[PDB]
Amino acid sequence: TKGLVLGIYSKEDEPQFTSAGENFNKLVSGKLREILNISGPPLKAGKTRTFYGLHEDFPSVVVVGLGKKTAGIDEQENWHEGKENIRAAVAAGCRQIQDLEIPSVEVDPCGDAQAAAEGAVLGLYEYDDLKQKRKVVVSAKLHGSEDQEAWQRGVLFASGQNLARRLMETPANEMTPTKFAEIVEENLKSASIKTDVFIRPKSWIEEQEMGSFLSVAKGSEEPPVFLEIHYKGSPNASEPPLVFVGKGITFDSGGISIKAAANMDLMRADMGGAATICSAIVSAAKLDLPINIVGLAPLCENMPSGKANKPGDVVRARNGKTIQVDNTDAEGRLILADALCYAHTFNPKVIINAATLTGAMDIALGSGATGVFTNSSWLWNKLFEASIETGDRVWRMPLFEHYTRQVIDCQLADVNNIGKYRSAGACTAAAFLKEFVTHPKWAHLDIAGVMTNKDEVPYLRKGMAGRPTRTLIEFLFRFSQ
Amino acid sequence: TKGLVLGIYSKEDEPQFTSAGENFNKLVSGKLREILNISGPPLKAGKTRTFYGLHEDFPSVVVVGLGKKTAGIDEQENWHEGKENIRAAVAAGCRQIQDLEIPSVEVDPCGDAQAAAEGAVLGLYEYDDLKQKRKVVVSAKLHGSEDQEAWQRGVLFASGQNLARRLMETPANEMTPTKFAEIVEENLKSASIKTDVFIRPKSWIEEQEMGSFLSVAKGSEEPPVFLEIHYKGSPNASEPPLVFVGKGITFDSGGISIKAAANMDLMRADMGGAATICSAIVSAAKLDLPINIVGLAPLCENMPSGKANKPGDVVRARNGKTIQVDNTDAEGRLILADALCYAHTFNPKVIINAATLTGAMDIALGSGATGVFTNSSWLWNKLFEASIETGDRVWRMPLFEHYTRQVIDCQLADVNNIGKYRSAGACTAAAFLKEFVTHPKWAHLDIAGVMTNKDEVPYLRKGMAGRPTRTLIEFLFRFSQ
Amino acid sequence: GQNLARRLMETPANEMTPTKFAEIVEENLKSASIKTDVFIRPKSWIEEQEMGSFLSVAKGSEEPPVFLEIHYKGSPNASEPPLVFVGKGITFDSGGISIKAAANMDLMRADMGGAATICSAIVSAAKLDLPINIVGLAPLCENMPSGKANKPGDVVRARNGKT
Amino acid sequence: XVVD
Amino acid sequence: XVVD
Amino acid sequence: XVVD
Ligand SMILES: [Zn+2]
Ligand SMILES: [Zn+2]
Ligand SMILES: [Zn+2]
Ligand SMILES: [Zn+2]
Ligand SMILES: [Zn+2]
């Protein structure tokens, strides 16, 4: 009927199968082991081989190379390596079944059902909705009955990420401020009725004196929205929450400090800060974690017009500070000035904001790990340890006064929204946000280098990666335990 | 006769003087305390005030603000803050004496004679030699007889840095490969006769099959030099050494992948990798540290000509690997490929290379800390702890296989000297060097964001900063103890 | 015949210089048929031939120019007029003083693809032992910036007298 | 997204 | 020094 | 190769 993804490790005397693979070989009376031998060189990790008609039920059987059985935490790479081996291997195996146009697959748990489910649900995702020319939708299920809640924990974690990838990948004319708030809203309520959504309009934002955010949204005719999500997971309702904040620019053209044409279409994903944190709240609520979490996301477009922000303008943040808006394409800073002052209202335990903030983070680490600026090494350590697990790596960046300085010397105002130099572009923008944060446990995750995948993360196809939504979910899980 | 720099802390009942300052006030029968009161608002840290004719011997007395008496290691900034307070304050005080055209100054030890001597000898330096229009050369001495070897340890550490700043600041037509080797050579022999210098010519480099380094030097008519320094400080001559490697491009024009005109004069400091490590060996030998250290520095210019390197060329490194030279302005990589294979010859304990390698490190951290890529968290930790002390900060950067990949996929060759993308520019160049390193304790310090000072480090005037020569000297001191 | 051309083109210009290119084509043409003659004409010949326009380009580099001349005598009558092929042989085009941008200038190692293509086809015509006479002509030099390169505005005289 |  |  |  269907397909079957099966694993095997690198040599012992004979490279060894997963116990599911060994079982299946016994079931077809040694025929898998035999056809593997006839097919030639052994399967190294991530690689694939397909075998036809070994069993009446699995006419296509894909054997995937899982590398070393005992691969664990790598000190150099800072991740569990086995989990990463398995994500890439069952992603590759699953896409081979899909190219065979087979609608269903049974996936080998590979000794870690959670990492097996993450490779298949992440590796098979595309965002197909607007092409009439689509791939067969395959349905991936666990090959077995034994480790079920781990496999479904993987399905949970990976679907939390794929929500983010879909929120990001959708063209900005469909994923506007209102549309984004409405999809997150429904996704949060289906996850738990211990939720409340507030899709706050322009009049509220005005009443909230969020003039820095309003200054950015004015150039467009698309209405701003301030999204506020609550997941009431603690037994006591009066437990202080963990707050998440995210940049929600649904399209960044730069405005009057207009962007170059080349590849500005990827700016439809400049709400990836709001996608990532909102997907993790949806997944925390699905996981029904015993914690209270608020989700905050300013959503607007940044367009040029006869009423847009002009370079040089001084706008007042909620907290009374004035910002000189020297460059209109440093709008995340602005939107986040106001949303971060608002987070202190909730009396948080932790404030975590995420944002596709600077191209300089991309030049920096950009691609291999998201940069996290934190005044809390406790919080740094928490995110970093969750990162080992998920494999969706995080790397620390300096939150030194030296950078504050380059943003504090300012002609008309209290803070300038851009530094005098090109140097340390992501550290200066981090210094701008700290100006709007008094909290002792604050992390700023600059997600701009991890916005996209090409080939680097094996189990993700080309397009918006939804990174780092799983490191964020893992952090909340561990924080709740 | 002379001037006197005196310190004071921020309030207690009356802000308190250093005991030298209190003594001097008693000596002029309370007149300093009295004129300070009449002069108005208290001196915050780094700030200065000058008082005339308080004493027959010190007709100019500059009182410098030292901030909080008990300021120590800051967790957010990762440095001793008091040491940093003192460097900036006696640098500012000393430059006030120099503007008074006073040739000598007595400097208050400020509770830390080493940090007091570092602010004065670093803060007073310029590189004056080619202007006929110069500032008075002032002679800075300790105000007292009590803590002498700490003050002279400061003079040592700061002169080790100022050597580097002079090696870097000198116009490349004077600081050529031969000239650089000859100044380091003399500076190392004056430091100790337990030294050997080898200013290896082109014929040796050719014999050593350093084709990647030779490929870069050929476009210029200025001769290449491979500098090899030895400091034999251990009791046993057979102790394995610590090896340092440094990029010595005496001018980087880019070659055929030619640089833009704007500010390409700062490329005279692209031998700042060789300046930094060579100054630290000179200072280790002056400190007469009980360790063995080899200093390795390939020195050449990178010019366009009818025989320069062409984009696309494949050259063979000493280790047999081929490099495709896709961009001629990624020459540090090349010079360092060969010098780093050569470092394994010495059978090292540690291999530390430094280099003004990429502009991407400048966009990254660039300015606030030098980036260190290491396969050794032990070594990371050593450099980082020395950095707290010196205040000349270091920050870790990823040495992940993901980046190796972007440099390993290569059309004609084993390694390409540049990655397909702009992303993670300093991590890809670090990945290129690791290809030429088998050693378990290797650190690559990319010094390009700390090549220059403008205003950021208070105790350094504008120009080549010689960073991080003191963190390197501190590392060797602690390593030797 | 095509894969020869792809290899002549793909090889880094520091290995596939004017002399090297002429020498690989030369051997490839003689193995194809002994009804061949190769002339790897040096700078002195090119000078004697008053090819000042070609010489103007080759001067900026220290890599020597070569004017490659190939003959395949395939007709029964030696006096049959030939088919002539000509091909551009710049072994690396940096642009010279009108210098190229760094981005992807490594593909300019294949700017002798005019000389590779036509020379590979003569080698294959001779292998096929086609009953025709064919001459192969390819000026081979690099185009580099230097203290003696061509300057924008310079007037040079072609073999035919035009400036 | 500013650039650098 | 390459740029980026 | 000129450009255009
Ligand atoms: Zn922007
Ligand atoms: Zn360069
Ligand atoms: Zn943006
Ligand atoms: Zn360089
Ligand atoms: Zn051309």
Coordinates of N, CA and C in Angstrom, one line a residue, chain B residues 265-368:
Chain B
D265 N 44.2 53.2 2.7 CA 45.4 53.5 3.4 C 45.6 52.7 4.7
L266 N 44.4 52.4 5.3 CA 44.4 51.6 6.6 C 44.9 50.2 6.3
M267 N 45.0 49.7 5.0 CA 45.6 48.4 4.7 C 47.0 48.3 4.9
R268 N 47.8 49.4 5.2 CA 49.2 49.4 5.7 C 49.2 48.5 7.0
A269 N 48.1 48.4 7.7 CA 48.0 47.7 9.0 C 47.5 46.3 8.9
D270 N 47.5 45.7 7.6 CA 47.2 44.3 7.4 C 48.3 43.3 7.8
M271 N 49.4 43.8 8.3 CA 50.4 43.0 9.0 C 50.2 43.1 10.5
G272 N 49.0 43.5 11.0 CA 48.6 43.6 12.4 C 48.5 42.3 13.1
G273 N 48.4 41.2 12.3 CA 48.4 39.9 12.9 C 49.9 39.6 13.3
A274 N 50.8 39.8 12.4 CA 52.2 39.6 12.7 C 52.7 40.6 13.7
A275 N 52.3 41.9 13.7 CA 52.7 42.9 14.7 C 52.3 42.4 16.2
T276 N 51.0 42.2 16.4 CA 50.4 41.7 17.7 C 51.1 40.5 18.3
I277 N 51.3 39.4 17.6 CA 51.9 38.2 18.1 C 53.4 38.4 18.3
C278 N 54.1 39.1 17.4 CA 55.5 39.4 17.6 C 55.8 40.3 18.7
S279 N 54.9 41.2 19.0 CA 55.1 42.2 20.2 C 54.9 41.4 21.5
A280 N 53.9 40.5 21.5 CA 53.7 39.7 22.7 C 54.9 38.7 22.9
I281 N 55.7 38.2 21.9 CA 56.8 37.3 22.1 C 57.9 38.2 22.7
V282 N 58.1 39.4 22.1 CA 59.1 40.4 22.6 C 58.8 40.8 24.1
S283 N 57.5 40.9 24.5 CA 57.1 41.2 25.8 C 57.2 40.0 26.7
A284 N 57.0 38.7 26.2 CA 57.2 37.5 27.0 C 58.6 37.3 27.4
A285 N 59.5 37.6 26.4 CA 60.9 37.5 26.6 C 61.4 38.6 27.5
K286 N 60.9 39.9 27.5 CA 61.2 41.0 28.4 C 60.8 40.7 29.9
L287 N 59.7 40.0 30.0 CA 59.1 39.5 31.2 C 59.8 38.3 31.8
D288 N 60.6 37.7 30.9 CA 61.3 36.5 30.9 C 60.6 35.4 31.6
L289 N 59.5 35.2 31.0 CA 58.5 34.1 31.2 C 59.2 32.7 31.0
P290 N 58.9 31.7 31.9 CA 59.6 30.5 31.9 C 59.1 29.4 30.9
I291 N 58.8 29.9 29.7 CA 58.3 29.1 28.6 C 59.0 29.2 27.3
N292 N 58.8 28.2 26.4 CA 59.4 28.2 25.1 C 58.4 28.7 24.1
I293 N 58.6 29.7 23.2 CA 57.6 30.3 22.3 C 58.2 30.5 20.9
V294 N 57.5 30.0 19.8 CA 58.0 30.3 18.4 C 57.0 31.3 17.8
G295 N 57.5 32.2 17.1 CA 56.8 33.3 16.4 C 57.0 33.1 14.9
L296 N 55.8 33.0 14.2 CA 55.8 32.7 12.8 C 55.0 33.8 12.1
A297 N 55.5 34.4 11.0 CA 54.8 35.5 10.4 C 55.3 35.5 8.9
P298 N 54.4 35.1 7.9 CA 54.6 35.3 6.5 C 54.4 36.8 6.2
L299 N 55.5 37.4 5.6 CA 55.4 38.8 5.3 C 55.5 39.1 3.8
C300 N 54.5 39.6 3.1 CA 54.5 40.1 1.8 C 53.5 41.2 1.5
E301 N 53.6 41.9 0.3 CA 52.5 42.8 -0.1 C 51.6 42.1 -1.0
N302 N 50.3 42.6 -1.2 CA 49.4 42.0 -2.2 C 49.0 43.1 -3.2
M303 N 49.8 43.1 -4.3 CA 49.7 44.1 -5.4 C 49.1 43.5 -6.7
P304 N 48.5 44.4 -7.6 CA 48.2 44.0 -8.9 C 49.3 44.2 -9.9
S305 N 49.5 43.3 -10.8 CA 50.6 43.4 -11.8 C 50.4 42.4 -12.9
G306 N 51.4 42.4 -13.9 CA 51.4 41.5 -15.0 C 51.8 40.1 -14.6
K307 N 52.0 39.8 -13.3 CA 52.3 38.5 -12.8 C 51.6 38.2 -11.5
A308 N 50.6 39.0 -11.1 CA 49.9 38.8 -9.9 C 49.1 37.5 -9.9
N309 N 48.4 37.1 -8.9 CA 47.5 36.0 -8.8 C 46.3 36.4 -9.6
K310 N 45.7 35.5 -10.3 CA 44.5 35.7 -11.1 C 43.4 35.0 -10.4
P311 N 42.2 35.6 -10.3 CA 41.0 34.9 -9.9 C 40.8 33.6 -10.7
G312 N 40.6 32.5 -10.0 CA 40.4 31.2 -10.6 C 41.6 30.2 -10.5
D313 N 42.8 30.8 -10.3 CA 44.1 30.0 -10.1 C 44.1 28.9 -9.1
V314 N 44.7 27.8 -9.3 CA 44.8 26.8 -8.3 C 46.3 26.7 -7.9
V315 N 46.5 26.9 -6.6 CA 47.8 26.8 -6.0 C 47.9 25.7 -4.9
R316 N 49.1 25.1 -4.8 CA 49.2 24.0 -3.8 C 49.9 24.5 -2.5
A317 N 49.2 24.3 -1.4 CA 49.7 24.5 -0.1 C 50.8 23.5 0.3
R318 N 51.7 23.8 1.2 CA 52.7 22.9 1.8 C 52.2 21.5 2.1
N319 N 51.0 21.4 2.6 CA 50.3 20.1 2.9 C 49.7 19.3 1.8
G320 N 49.9 19.8 0.6 CA 49.5 19.1 -0.6 C 48.1 19.5 -1.1
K321 N 47.3 20.1 -0.3 CA 46.0 20.6 -0.7 C 46.1 21.7 -1.7
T322 N 45.2 21.7 -2.7 CA 45.0 22.7 -3.7 C 44.0 23.7 -3.2
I323 N 44.2 25.0 -3.4 CA 43.3 26.1 -3.1 C 42.8 26.7 -4.4
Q324 N 41.5 26.9 -4.7 CA 41.2 27.7 -5.8 C 41.1 29.2 -5.3
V325 N 41.9 30.1 -5.9 CA 42.0 31.5 -5.5 C 41.0 32.2 -6.3
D326 N 39.7 32.1 -5.9 CA 38.7 32.8 -6.6 C 38.6 34.3 -6.5
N327 N 39.2 34.8 -5.3 CA 39.2 36.2 -5.0 C 40.6 36.4 -4.4
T328 N 41.3 37.3 -5.1 CA 42.7 37.6 -4.8 C 42.8 38.5 -3.5
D329 N 41.7 39.0 -3.0 CA 41.7 39.8 -1.8 C 41.3 39.0 -0.5
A330 N 41.4 37.6 -0.7 CA 41.3 36.7 0.4 C 42.7 36.0 0.5
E331 N 43.7 36.9 0.8 CA 45.1 36.5 0.7 C 45.7 36.1 2.1
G332 N 45.1 36.6 3.1 CA 45.5 36.3 4.4 C 45.3 34.8 4.6
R333 N 44.2 34.2 4.2 CA 43.8 32.8 4.2 C 45.0 32.0 3.7
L334 N 45.5 32.4 2.5 CA 46.5 31.8 1.8 C 47.9 31.7 2.4
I335 N 48.2 32.9 3.0 CA 49.5 33.1 3.6 C 49.6 32.2 4.9
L336 N 48.4 32.2 5.5 CA 48.2 31.5 6.7 C 48.0 30.0 6.5
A337 N 47.6 29.5 5.4 CA 47.5 28.1 5.1 C 48.9 27.5 5.2
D338 N 49.9 28.1 4.6 CA 51.2 27.6 4.7 C 51.9 27.8 6.0
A339 N 51.7 29.0 6.7 CA 52.4 29.2 8.0 C 51.8 28.3 9.1
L340 N 50.5 27.9 9.0 CA 49.9 27.0 9.9 C 50.2 25.6 9.8
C341 N 50.6 25.1 8.6 CA 51.1 23.8 8.4 C 52.5 23.7 9.0
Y342 N 53.3 24.7 8.7 CA 54.6 24.9 9.3 C 54.6 24.9 10.8
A343 N 53.7 25.4 11.5 CA 53.6 25.4 13.0 C 53.5 24.0 13.6
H344 N 53.0 23.0 12.9 CA 52.9 21.7 13.4 C 54.3 21.0 13.4
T345 N 55.2 21.6 12.7 CA 56.6 21.1 12.7 C 57.3 21.2 14.0
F346 N 57.0 22.3 14.7 CA 57.6 22.6 16.0 C 57.1 21.7 17.2
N347 N 56.1 20.9 16.9 CA 55.4 20.1 17.9 C 54.9 20.9 19.0
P348 N 53.9 21.9 18.7 CA 53.4 22.8 19.7 C 52.5 22.3 20.8
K349 N 52.3 23.0 21.9 CA 51.3 22.8 22.9 C 50.0 23.4 22.6
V350 N 50.1 24.5 21.9 CA 49.1 25.5 21.5 C 49.5 26.1 20.2
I351 N 48.5 26.4 19.3 CA 48.8 27.2 18.1 C 47.8 28.3 18.2
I352 N 48.4 29.5 18.1 CA 47.5 30.7 18.2 C 47.9 31.5 17.0
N353 N 47.0 31.8 16.1 CA 47.3 32.7 15.0 C 46.4 33.9 15.2
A354 N 46.9 35.1 14.7 CA 46.1 36.3 14.7 C 46.1 36.9 13.3
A355 N 45.0 37.6 13.0 CA 44.9 38.2 11.6 C 43.8 39.2 11.4
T356 N 44.2 40.3 10.7 CA 43.2 41.3 10.2 C 42.6 40.7 8.9
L357 N 41.8 39.7 9.2 CA 41.3 38.8 8.1 C 40.1 39.1 7.2
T358 N 39.0 39.6 7.8 CA 37.8 39.8 7.1 C 37.2 41.1 7.6
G359 N 36.6 41.9 6.8 CA 35.8 43.0 7.1 C 34.5 42.5 7.8
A360 N 34.1 41.3 7.6 CA 32.9 40.7 8.2 C 33.0 40.5 9.7
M361 N 34.2 40.4 10.2 CA 34.4 40.4 11.7 C 34.1 41.8 12.2
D362 N 34.5 42.8 11.3 CA 34.2 44.1 11.8 C 32.7 44.4 11.8
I363 N 31.9 43.9 10.8 CA 30.5 44.1 10.8 C 29.9 43.3 12.0
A364 N 30.5 42.3 12.5 CA 30.0 41.4 13.5 C 30.0 41.9 14.9
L365 N 31.2 41.8 15.5 CA 31.5 42.3 16.8 C 32.2 43.6 16.8
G366 N 33.0 43.5 15.8 CA 33.9 44.5 15.2 C 33.8 45.8 15.9
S367 N 34.9 45.9 16.6 CA 35.3 47.0 17.5 C 35.3 46.7 18.9
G368 N 34.3 46.1 19.5 CA 34.2 45.8 20.9 C 35.0 44.6 21.5

